[PDB]
Design a protein around this ligand. Sequence first.
Ligand SMILES: Cc1cc2nc3c(=O)[nH]c(=O)nc-3n(C[C@H](O)[C@H](O)[C@H](O)COP(=O)(O)O)c2cc1C
Ligand SMILES: Nc1ncnc2c1ncn2[C@@H]1O[C@H](COP(=O)(O)OP(=O)(O)O)[C@@H](O)[C@H]1O
Ligand SMILES: [Mg+2]
Ligand SMILES: [Zn+2]
Length: 155
Amino acid sequence: GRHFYVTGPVVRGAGRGGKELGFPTANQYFHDTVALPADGVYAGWLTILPTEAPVSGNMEPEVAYAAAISVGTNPTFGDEQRSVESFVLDRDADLYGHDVKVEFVDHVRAMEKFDSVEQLLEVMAKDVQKTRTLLAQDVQAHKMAPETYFLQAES
Ligand SMILES: Cc1cc2nc3c(=O)[nH]c(=O)nc-3n(C[C@H](O)[C@H](O)[C@H](O)COP(=O)(O)O)c2cc1C
Ligand SMILES: Nc1ncnc2c1ncn2[C@@H]1O[C@H](COP(=O)(O)OP(=O)(O)O)[C@@H](O)[C@H]1O
Ligand SMILES: [Mg+2]
Ligand SMILES: [Zn+2]
């Protein structure tokens, strides 16, 4: 399809996204043989795949949730493995162990090594802003039915 996508279980990262950055990210790791988009930041959709497993929080399966997505090694922090990491906008759910699909709709920015967490946070806020606008255009492009996605303006 026109959206690059990957699927796989949400697994444990460094534990810093929510606690330290205020941007929790659902982490996926793939073998180096698996085709991925270029390291960078993307606007896209995260969907919990069809399942009978209970989901705790305000996300349910088979709905495309607006997400700001990073691909790479988190060079600001010097992490060892390449991850795909999805910050689901305006939601709060326990995704660990759930099988999810992540669709990459638009490239937003190159992956960058920032000197400080504070500088990184300022830029991530702007990535989220651009993600909202890009995803509203994508809704229109596919004439997506309201029940099939979740996308808000921020409070
Ligand atoms: C939209 C978005 C943009 C990001 N941009 C960068 C970046 O430019 N440089 C970087 O080192 N990490 C970037 N990250 C990743 C954060 O470093 C990472 O998600 C955070 O350290 C949490 O790590 P963890 O999930 O293992 O706890 C970005 C993450 C998101 C969600
Ligand atoms: N809006 C959200 N987007 C992504 N993950 C969320 C969100 N709200 C809660 N979570 C949960 O928080 C975890 C991500 O937080 P994070 O600090 O990045 O932990 P980790 O380092 O283990 O990836 C997810 O795996 C999921 O269970
Ligand atoms: Mg994370
Ligand atoms: Zn599209």
